[PDB]
mmCIF file of N, CA and C in Angstrom:
data_model
loop_
_atom_site.group_PDB
_atom_site.id
_atom_site.type_symbol
_atom_site.label_atom_id
_atom_site.label_comp_id
_atom_site.label_asym_id
_atom_site.label_seq_id
_atom_site.Cartn_x
_atom_site.Cartn_y
_atom_site.Cartn_z
ATOM 1 N N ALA H 249 0.819 -1.202 0.000
ATOM 2 C CA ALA H 249 0.000 0.000 0.000
ATOM 3 C C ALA H 249 0.855 1.254 0.000
ATOM 4 N N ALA H 250 2.037 1.198 0.609
ATOM 5 C CA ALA H 250 2.971 2.309 0.535
ATOM 6 C C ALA H 250 3.503 2.519 -0.868
ATOM 7 N N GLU H 251 3.735 1.447 -1.618
ATOM 8 C CA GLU H 251 4.183 1.605 -2.993
ATOM 9 C C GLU H 251 3.068 2.126 -3.886
ATOM 10 N N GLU H 252 1.834 1.678 -3.650
ATOM 11 C CA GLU H 252 0.692 2.241 -4.369
ATOM 12 C C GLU H 252 0.509 3.716 -4.058
ATOM 13 N N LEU H 253 0.709 4.096 -2.798
ATOM 14 C CA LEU H 253 0.623 5.493 -2.404
ATOM 15 C C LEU H 253 1.735 6.311 -3.035
ATOM 16 N N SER H 254 2.924 5.728 -3.155
ATOM 17 C CA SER H 254 4.031 6.426 -3.787
ATOM 18 C C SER H 254 3.792 6.613 -5.271
ATOM 19 N N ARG H 255 3.093 5.682 -5.906
ATOM 20 C CA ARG H 255 2.828 5.822 -7.329
ATOM 21 C C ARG H 255 1.581 6.636 -7.639
ATOM 22 N N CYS H 256 0.684 6.842 -6.677
ATOM 23 C CA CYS H 256 -0.501 7.664 -6.911
ATOM 24 C C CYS H 256 -0.246 9.148 -6.751
ATOM 25 N N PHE H 257 1.003 9.565 -6.661
ATOM 26 C CA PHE H 257 1.376 10.952 -6.488
ATOM 27 C C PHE H 257 2.523 11.275 -7.429
ATOM 28 N N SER H 258 2.977 12.520 -7.390
ATOM 29 C CA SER H 258 4.105 12.917 -8.210
ATOM 30 C C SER H 258 5.394 12.328 -7.645
ATOM 31 N N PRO H 259 6.409 12.099 -8.491
ATOM 32 C CA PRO H 259 7.653 11.506 -7.994
ATOM 33 C C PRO H 259 8.396 12.415 -7.045
ATOM 34 N N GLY H 260 8.436 12.033 -5.778
ATOM 35 C CA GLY H 260 9.155 12.827 -4.817
ATOM 36 C C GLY H 260 8.403 13.149 -3.549
ATOM 37 N N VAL H 261 7.069 13.184 -3.580
ATOM 38 C CA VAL H 261 6.347 13.642 -2.397
ATOM 39 C C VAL H 261 6.262 12.563 -1.330
ATOM 40 N N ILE H 262 6.136 11.300 -1.711
ATOM 41 C CA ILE H 262 6.003 10.207 -0.761
ATOM 42 C C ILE H 262 7.325 9.467 -0.730
ATOM 43 N N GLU H 263 8.011 9.546 0.398
ATOM 44 C CA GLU H 263 9.228 8.789 0.640
ATOM 45 C C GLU H 263 8.834 7.488 1.314
ATOM 46 N N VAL H 264 8.854 6.397 0.564
ATOM 47 C CA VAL H 264 8.630 5.078 1.135
ATOM 48 C C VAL H 264 9.974 4.489 1.553
ATOM 49 N N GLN H 265 10.064 4.063 2.807
ATOM 50 C CA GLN H 265 11.349 3.759 3.406
ATOM 51 C C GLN H 265 11.248 2.496 4.244
ATOM 52 N N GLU H 266 12.363 1.777 4.323
ATOM 53 C CA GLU H 266 12.428 0.472 4.975
ATOM 54 C C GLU H 266 13.015 0.675 6.364
ATOM 55 N N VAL H 267 12.146 0.959 7.332
ATOM 56 C CA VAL H 267 12.609 1.202 8.692
ATOM 57 C C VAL H 267 13.000 -0.105 9.369
ATOM 58 N N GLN H 268 12.086 -1.069 9.379
ATOM 59 C CA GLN H 268 12.297 -2.374 9.984
ATOM 60 C C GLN H 268 12.729 -3.404 8.951
ATOM 61 N N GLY H 269 12.675 -3.045 7.673
ATOM 62 C CA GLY H 269 12.649 -3.972 6.577
ATOM 63 C C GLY H 269 11.315 -3.954 5.867
ATOM 64 N N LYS H 270 10.236 -3.826 6.629
ATOM 65 C CA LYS H 270 8.943 -3.464 6.080
ATOM 66 C C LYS H 270 8.966 -2.009 5.642
ATOM 67 N N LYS H 271 8.104 -1.677 4.692
ATOM 68 C CA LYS H 271 8.073 -0.344 4.118
ATOM 69 C C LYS H 271 6.944 0.463 4.735
ATOM 70 N N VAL H 272 7.247 1.689 5.146
ATOM 71 C CA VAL H 272 6.224 2.655 5.519
ATOM 72 C C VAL H 272 6.391 3.883 4.644
ATOM 73 N N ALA H 273 5.306 4.633 4.501
ATOM 74 C CA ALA H 273 5.263 5.816 3.662
ATOM 75 C C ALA H 273 5.151 7.063 4.520
ATOM 76 N N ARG H 274 5.779 8.136 4.055
ATOM 77 C CA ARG H 274 5.664 9.426 4.708
ATOM 78 C C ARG H 274 5.704 10.511 3.651
ATOM 79 N N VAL H 275 5.086 11.644 3.954
ATOM 80 C CA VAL H 275 5.146 12.780 3.047
ATOM 81 C C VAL H 275 6.501 13.453 3.208
ATOM 82 N N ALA H 276 7.174 13.677 2.093
ATOM 83 C CA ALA H 276 8.482 14.312 2.078
ATOM 84 C C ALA H 276 8.481 15.288 0.921
ATOM 85 N N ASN H 277 8.556 16.583 1.222
ATOM 86 C CA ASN H 277 8.439 17.679 0.261
ATOM 87 C C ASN H 277 7.143 17.589 -0.542
ATOM 88 N N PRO H 278 5.991 17.955 0.034
ATOM 89 C CA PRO H 278 4.731 17.931 -0.721
ATOM 90 C C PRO H 278 4.593 19.014 -1.771
ATOM 91 N N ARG H 279 5.589 19.884 -1.944
ATOM 92 C CA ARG H 279 5.567 20.910 -2.976
ATOM 93 C C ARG H 279 5.559 20.327 -4.376
ATOM 94 N N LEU H 280 6.034 19.099 -4.548
ATOM 95 C CA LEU H 280 6.173 18.491 -5.859
ATOM 96 C C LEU H 280 4.852 18.039 -6.448
ATOM 97 N N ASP H 281 3.799 17.935 -5.645
ATOM 98 C CA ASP H 281 2.556 17.357 -6.127
ATOM 99 C C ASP H 281 1.843 18.323 -7.052
ATOM 100 N N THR H 282 1.241 17.773 -8.098
ATOM 101 C CA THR H 282 0.604 18.557 -9.138
ATOM 102 C C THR H 282 -0.908 18.524 -9.055
ATOM 103 N N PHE H 283 -1.455 17.937 -7.994
ATOM 104 C CA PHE H 283 -2.873 17.614 -7.844
ATOM 105 C C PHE H 283 -3.440 16.906 -9.066
ATOM 106 N N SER H 284 -2.838 15.775 -9.393
ATOM 107 C CA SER H 284 -3.490 14.884 -10.329
ATOM 108 C C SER H 284 -4.652 14.165 -9.678
ATOM 109 N N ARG H 285 -4.667 14.118 -8.342
ATOM 110 C CA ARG H 285 -5.718 13.511 -7.529
ATOM 111 C C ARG H 285 -5.933 12.051 -7.899
ATOM 112 N N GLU H 286 -4.843 11.357 -8.199
ATOM 113 C CA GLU H 286 -4.930 9.969 -8.612
ATOM 114 C C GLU H 286 -5.204 9.051 -7.437
ATOM 115 N N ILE H 287 -4.935 9.514 -6.218
ATOM 116 C CA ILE H 287 -5.214 8.725 -5.033
ATOM 117 C C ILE H 287 -6.713 8.569 -4.804
ATOM 118 N N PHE H 288 -7.532 9.447 -5.374
ATOM 119 C CA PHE H 288 -8.977 9.351 -5.247
ATOM 120 C C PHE H 288 -9.587 8.338 -6.199
ATOM 121 N N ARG H 289 -8.785 7.687 -7.032
ATOM 122 C CA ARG H 289 -9.246 6.567 -7.832
ATOM 123 C C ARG H 289 -8.928 5.231 -7.198
ATOM 124 N N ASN H 290 -7.909 5.187 -6.355
ATOM 125 C CA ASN H 290 -7.644 4.015 -5.540
ATOM 126 C C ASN H 290 -8.690 3.954 -4.442
ATOM 127 N N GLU H 291 -9.492 2.892 -4.443
ATOM 128 C CA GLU H 291 -10.650 2.838 -3.560
ATOM 129 C C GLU H 291 -10.242 2.602 -2.113
ATOM 130 N N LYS H 292 -9.209 1.794 -1.893
ATOM 131 C CA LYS H 292 -8.780 1.498 -0.535
ATOM 132 C C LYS H 292 -8.045 2.672 0.089
ATOM 133 N N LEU H 293 -7.195 3.343 -0.681
ATOM 134 C CA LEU H 293 -6.313 4.371 -0.155
ATOM 135 C C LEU H 293 -6.871 5.776 -0.278
ATOM 136 N N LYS H 294 -8.112 5.945 -0.713
ATOM 137 C CA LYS H 294 -8.640 7.301 -0.740
ATOM 138 C C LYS H 294 -9.151 7.752 0.615
ATOM 139 N N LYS H 295 -9.061 6.907 1.637
ATOM 140 C CA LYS H 295 -9.495 7.242 2.980
ATOM 141 C C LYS H 295 -8.336 7.552 3.910
ATOM 142 N N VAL H 296 -7.100 7.299 3.493
ATOM 143 C CA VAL H 296 -5.949 7.449 4.374
ATOM 144 C C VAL H 296 -5.208 8.751 4.161
ATOM 145 N N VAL H 297 -5.452 9.458 3.065
ATOM 146 C CA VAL H 297 -4.785 10.722 2.807
ATOM 147 C C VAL H 297 -5.821 11.828 2.824
ATOM 148 N N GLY M 103 -28.289 -40.310 -101.061
ATOM 149 C CA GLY M 103 -28.452 -38.949 -100.587
ATOM 150 C C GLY M 103 -29.887 -38.475 -100.618
ATOM 151 N N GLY M 104 -30.831 -39.348 -100.265
ATOM 152 C CA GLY M 104 -32.227 -38.949 -100.257
ATOM 153 C C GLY M 104 -32.571 -38.024 -99.112
ATOM 154 N N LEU M 105 -31.819 -38.120 -98.008
ATOM 155 C CA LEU M 105 -31.985 -37.327 -96.788
ATOM 156 C C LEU M 105 -33.396 -37.491 -96.216
ATOM 157 N N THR M 106 -33.676 -38.719 -95.807
ATOM 158 C CA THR M 106 -34.948 -39.023 -95.177
ATOM 159 C C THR M 106 -34.959 -38.542 -93.733
ATOM 160 N N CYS M 107 -36.158 -38.464 -93.172
ATOM 161 C CA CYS M 107 -36.301 -38.087 -91.776
ATOM 162 C C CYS M 107 -36.080 -39.303 -90.885
ATOM 163 N N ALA M 108 -35.090 -39.221 -90.004
ATOM 164 C CA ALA M 108 -34.793 -40.307 -89.087
ATOM 165 C C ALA M 108 -35.677 -40.193 -87.848
ATOM 166 N N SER M 109 -35.463 -41.101 -86.901
ATOM 167 C CA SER M 109 -36.332 -41.186 -85.740
ATOM 168 C C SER M 109 -35.973 -40.118 -84.707
ATOM 169 N N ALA M 110 -36.755 -40.090 -83.635
ATOM 170 C CA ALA M 110 -36.501 -39.160 -82.547
ATOM 171 C C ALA M 110 -35.328 -39.653 -81.704
ATOM 172 N N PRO M 111 -34.502 -38.751 -81.177
ATOM 173 C CA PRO M 111 -33.358 -39.190 -80.376
ATOM 174 C C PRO M 111 -33.762 -39.700 -79.004
ATOM 175 N N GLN M 112 -32.884 -40.525 -78.431
ATOM 176 C CA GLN M 112 -33.146 -41.147 -77.139
ATOM 177 C C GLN M 112 -32.927 -40.167 -75.995
ATOM 178 N N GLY M 113 -31.831 -39.413 -76.040
ATOM 179 C CA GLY M 113 -31.497 -38.500 -74.966
ATOM 180 C C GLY M 113 -30.539 -37.402 -75.375
ATOM 181 N N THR M 114 -29.747 -36.908 -74.425
ATOM 182 C CA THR M 114 -28.880 -35.762 -74.662
ATOM 183 C C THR M 114 -27.634 -35.866 -73.802
ATOM 184 N N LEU M 115 -26.475 -35.938 -74.442
ATOM 185 C CA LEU M 115 -25.218 -35.708 -73.755
ATOM 186 C C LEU M 115 -24.866 -34.236 -73.858
ATOM 187 N N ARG M 116 -24.227 -33.718 -72.819
ATOM 188 C CA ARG M 116 -23.867 -32.308 -72.769
ATOM 189 C C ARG M 116 -22.505 -32.188 -72.114
ATOM 190 N N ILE M 117 -21.512 -31.767 -72.884
ATOM 191 C CA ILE M 117 -20.135 -31.675 -72.422
ATOM 192 C C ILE M 117 -19.854 -30.231 -72.041
ATOM 193 N N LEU M 118 -19.279 -30.035 -70.860
ATOM 194 C CA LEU M 118 -18.909 -28.711 -70.398
ATOM 195 C C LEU M 118 -17.814 -28.869 -69.359
ATOM 196 N N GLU M 119 -16.974 -27.845 -69.235
ATOM 197 C CA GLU M 119 -15.884 -27.896 -68.274
ATOM 198 C C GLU M 119 -16.399 -27.821 -66.845
ATOM 199 N N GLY M 120 -15.772 -28.599 -65.974
ATOM 200 C CA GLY M 120 -16.049 -28.533 -64.563
ATOM 201 C C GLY M 120 -14.985 -27.735 -63.844
ATOM 202 N N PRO M 121 -15.378 -26.968 -62.835
ATOM 203 C CA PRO M 121 -14.396 -26.208 -62.061
ATOM 204 C C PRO M 121 -13.691 -27.097 -61.055
ATOM 205 N N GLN M 122 -12.494 -26.670 -60.670
ATOM 206 C CA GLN M 122 -11.707 -27.382 -59.674
ATOM 207 C C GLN M 122 -11.934 -26.741 -58.310
ATOM 208 N N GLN M 123 -12.240 -27.572 -57.318
ATOM 209 C CA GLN M 123 -12.582 -27.108 -55.982
ATOM 210 C C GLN M 123 -11.694 -27.759 -54.932
ATOM 211 N N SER M 124 -10.490 -28.165 -55.336
ATOM 212 C CA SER M 124 -9.496 -28.602 -54.365
ATOM 213 C C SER M 124 -8.942 -27.421 -53.577
ATOM 214 N N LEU M 125 -8.985 -26.220 -54.160
ATOM 215 C CA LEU M 125 -8.528 -25.029 -53.454
ATOM 216 C C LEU M 125 -9.590 -24.527 -52.484
ATOM 217 N N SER M 126 -10.768 -24.180 -52.996
ATOM 218 C CA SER M 126 -11.838 -23.677 -52.151
ATOM 219 C C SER M 126 -12.461 -24.819 -51.348
ATOM 220 N N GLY M 127 -13.276 -24.453 -50.365
ATOM 221 C CA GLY M 127 -13.635 -25.375 -49.310
ATOM 222 C C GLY M 127 -12.598 -25.489 -48.216
ATOM 223 N N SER M 128 -11.476 -24.781 -48.349
ATOM 224 C CA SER M 128 -10.439 -24.709 -47.342
ATOM 225 C C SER M 128 -10.926 -23.848 -46.182
ATOM 226 N N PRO M 129 -10.208 -23.837 -45.055
ATOM 227 C CA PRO M 129 -10.459 -22.795 -44.055
ATOM 228 C C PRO M 129 -10.208 -21.414 -44.635
ATOM 229 N N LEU M 130 -11.056 -20.470 -44.233
ATOM 230 C CA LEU M 130 -11.027 -19.118 -44.764
ATOM 231 C C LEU M 130 -9.727 -18.436 -44.368
ATOM 232 N N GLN M 131 -9.284 -17.505 -45.202
ATOM 233 C CA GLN M 131 -8.112 -16.687 -44.901
ATOM 234 C C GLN M 131 -8.512 -15.219 -44.885
ATOM 235 N N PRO M 132 -8.981 -14.724 -43.751
ATOM 236 C CA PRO M 132 -9.403 -13.331 -43.648
ATOM 237 C C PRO M 132 -8.204 -12.402 -43.533
ATOM 238 N N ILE M 133 -8.483 -11.106 -43.609
ATOM 239 C CA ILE M 133 -7.473 -10.085 -43.371
ATOM 240 C C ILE M 133 -7.269 -9.970 -41.865
ATOM 241 N N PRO M 134 -6.029 -9.949 -41.374
ATOM 242 C CA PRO M 134 -5.807 -9.930 -39.923
ATOM 243 C C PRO M 134 -6.226 -8.605 -39.311
ATOM 244 N N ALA M 135 -6.815 -8.684 -38.122
ATOM 245 C CA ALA M 135 -7.303 -7.497 -37.440
ATOM 246 C C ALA M 135 -6.146 -6.611 -37.008
ATOM 247 N N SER M 136 -6.315 -5.309 -37.196
ATOM 248 C CA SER M 136 -5.327 -4.363 -36.713
ATOM 249 C C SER M 136 -5.343 -4.364 -35.189
ATOM 250 N N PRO M 137 -4.191 -4.166 -34.540
ATOM 251 C CA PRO M 137 -4.154 -4.273 -33.087
ATOM 252 C C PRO M 137 -4.870 -3.101 -32.445
ATOM 253 N N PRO M 138 -5.447 -3.291 -31.258
ATOM 254 C CA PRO M 138 -5.979 -2.153 -30.526
ATOM 255 C C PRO M 138 -4.845 -1.270 -30.049
ATOM 256 N N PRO M 139 -5.095 0.021 -29.844
ATOM 257 C CA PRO M 139 -4.006 0.920 -29.462
ATOM 258 C C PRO M 139 -3.506 0.623 -28.060
ATOM 259 N N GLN M 140 -2.208 0.380 -27.965
ATOM 260 C CA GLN M 140 -1.566 0.019 -26.717
ATOM 261 C C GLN M 140 -0.745 1.208 -26.255
ATOM 262 N N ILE M 141 -0.648 1.382 -24.942
ATOM 263 C CA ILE M 141 0.105 2.517 -24.396
ATOM 264 C C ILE M 141 1.583 2.332 -24.703
ATOM 265 N N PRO M 142 2.303 3.387 -25.082
ATOM 266 C CA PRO M 142 3.719 3.227 -25.368
ATOM 267 C C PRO M 142 4.495 2.970 -24.089
ATOM 268 N N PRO M 143 5.554 2.179 -24.153
ATOM 269 C CA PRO M 143 6.412 2.013 -22.982
ATOM 270 C C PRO M 143 7.325 3.215 -22.814
ATOM 271 N N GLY M 144 7.773 3.408 -21.581
ATOM 272 C CA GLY M 144 8.672 4.506 -21.312
ATOM 273 C C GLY M 144 8.009 5.854 -21.211
ATOM 274 N N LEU M 145 6.757 5.903 -20.772
ATOM 275 C CA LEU M 145 6.079 7.160 -20.503
ATOM 276 C C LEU M 145 6.354 7.550 -19.064
ATOM 277 N N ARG M 146 6.895 8.738 -18.871
ATOM 278 C CA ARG M 146 7.297 9.231 -17.567
ATOM 279 C C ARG M 146 6.686 10.601 -17.342
ATOM 280 N N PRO M 147 6.563 11.030 -16.094
ATOM 281 C CA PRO M 147 6.170 12.417 -15.837
ATOM 282 C C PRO M 147 7.270 13.392 -16.197
ATOM 283 N N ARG M 148 7.104 14.082 -17.318
ATOM 284 C CA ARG M 148 8.086 15.067 -17.734
ATOM 285 C C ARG M 148 7.865 16.406 -17.058
ATOM 286 N N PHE M 149 6.615 16.781 -16.826
ATOM 287 C CA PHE M 149 6.295 18.065 -16.225
ATOM 288 C C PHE M 149 6.343 17.935 -14.714
ATOM 289 N N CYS M 150 7.187 18.735 -14.084
ATOM 290 C CA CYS M 150 7.176 18.905 -12.645
ATOM 291 C C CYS M 150 6.674 20.303 -12.331
ATOM 292 N N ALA M 151 5.915 20.422 -11.246
ATOM 293 C CA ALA M 151 5.259 21.678 -10.917
ATOM 294 C C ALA M 151 6.282 22.714 -10.487
ATOM 295 N N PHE M 152 6.015 23.978 -10.812
ATOM 296 C CA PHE M 152 6.985 25.025 -10.534
ATOM 297 C C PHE M 152 7.072 25.324 -9.050
ATOM 298 N N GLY M 153 8.234 25.812 -8.631
ATOM 299 C CA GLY M 153 8.547 25.840 -7.224
ATOM 300 C C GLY M 153 8.583 24.469 -6.609
#
């Protein structure tokens, strides 16, 4: 879901990182986003952002 | 050479060429369908927002 979140945005805003080995997502420089609003087409992840 | 009238004929032979059908009756050979439009590979976000 972190990789899907990273791909539903512009390249750069979501830093998906391996803290434990598992991946978590965080917002990193949200200035890069162009409001394509592609996360609102993902049905599962349109409730988490 | 008196040329008398002869009798009525029995029947009729009729000679005509027959077509060859070893070719046709085969499975049909249609024109192949053009492919549906597929997305090109290597499409990337070229535009990054200003600032």
